[PDB]
Amino acid sequence: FHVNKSGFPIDSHTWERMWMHVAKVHPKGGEMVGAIRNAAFLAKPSIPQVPNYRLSMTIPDWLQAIQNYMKTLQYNHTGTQFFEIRKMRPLSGLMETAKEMTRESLPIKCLEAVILGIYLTNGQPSIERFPISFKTYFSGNYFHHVVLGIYCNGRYGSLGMSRRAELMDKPLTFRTLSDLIFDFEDSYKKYLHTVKKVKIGLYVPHEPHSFQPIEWKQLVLNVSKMLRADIRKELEKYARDMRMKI
Amino acid sequence: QKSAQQELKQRQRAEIYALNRVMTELEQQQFDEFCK
C-alpha cells in the first residue's frame, strides 16, 4: 500500500517501487513485468468523458453516469495509489485534486472515489453527500473503507469504489440511514468481515468556506459491541439530526 | 520541458492500464479460489 506523492509524470522512485510490488505479488511476476515495461505496441487507453448534469437527465441516470465513470477509470489493483488525498485538507484543495484525477484519468481506490463523487455532485443541491467509513476485521487484520453516502428526495444511497461489487454503489431506495448501513454490514459478511466501527460524517457543503474540510466522524459507532436495535436507534437519531440541520 | 513530460505521462498511463488489467484478473482468480 504505497501512495504516489511525486505528481505526474510519476518519478523514478515511485515508479520502480510499484513495479517491484506487482512483480512480487503476481505468481509469474518477472515474466509479467517484462511483457509490459517498454512494450512497443501497447494500446493507448481511451479517455472517458467526464459526466456533467443536464436538465435532460433524471437524477438516478445522472448518478449512474457518475458511477459508470468511476468504473471506467477502474479500481486500482496496482498497489500504488496515484493521487494523494490528505483527508483533513480543505475542500478547496481537495477539489483541485479531483479535477486533476479527471485530467490524468487513472485507476482509483475508495478514498479517491469519495472525493471524485463530491466533485461530480457539487452544484446539485437536491443531493446531500456525506462520507460513511467502515473499520472491519478479517482473519486477524483490520481493514478500512469509505464510501459517499447520498440522500435525495427522501431516499438514501451511495457512490463508491471497492474490490467488491457489493461495497460501493447503492441505489436511491433505502428509506432510512439504518437500512443503508445494515445493507453494507450484510454485504461485508458475505466476505467474512466483521464490522467493528461505523463512522458517519456531516453533509458536505455544496459551497464550503475557504477553509472548511470534510468532517469524517461526527458519529462513531462501535458496532461489534452493540445490538441491532441499539445501532438502528443511534443511526436514526443522528440521521434526523442531519435532516434538521441541528 | 512541458512536452517530453506529456509523452512520459501517456507512456506511464498505457503501462498502468495494462498492469491494472493483469492485476484485476489475478484478484478475480484469487477471489474465485475464496468463493470455491
* Catalytic site includes residue A162: yes
Environment class of B20 (CB within 10 Å of its CB; exposed 0-12, middle 13-18, buried 19+): buried
* Catalytic site includes residue A145: yes
Distance CA A219, CA A199 (A): 5
Q: What's the domain count of chain A?
A: 1
DSSP state of A101: H
Would you say A174 and A180 are in contact if contact means Cβ atoms under 8 Å apart? yes
CA distance B35 to chain A (A): 9
- Parallel, antiparallel, or unpaired for β A128-138 and A155-159? unpaired
Instruction: For residue A78, give the nearest of B5, B14, B16 by CB distance.
Output: B16
The residue type at B19: L
- Helix, strand and coil content of chain B, in percent to the nearest 5, comes to 90, 0, 10
CA distance B2 to chain A (A): 11
Give the residue from B7, B17, B27 with the most A CB atoms within 10 Å of its CB, the best one to mutate: B17
CA distance A9 to chain B (A): 5
Range of the domain at A202: 1-246
Residue A132 burial (CB count, 10 A): 24
Cα–Cα distances (Å) from A74 to A106, A122, A163, B16, in that order, read: 8, 22, 10, 11
> Within 13 Å and on the Cβ side, how many CA atoms surround A29?
11
Among A138, A129, A8, residue whose Cα is nearest residue A80 = A8
At B23 the three-state DSSP class reads helix
Sheet holding A155-159, edge to edge: A170-174, A155-159, A141-152, A128-138, A194-200, A219-221
∠ CA B25-A11-B1 to the nearest 5 degrees? 120
Q: Which residues contact A233 (CB under 8 A, 6 or more apart)?
A: none
* Catalytic site includes residue A110: yes
Method: X-ray
Residue A158 burial (CB count, 10 A): 27
Any idea which residue has 466501527 for its cell? A197
The residue type at A42: L
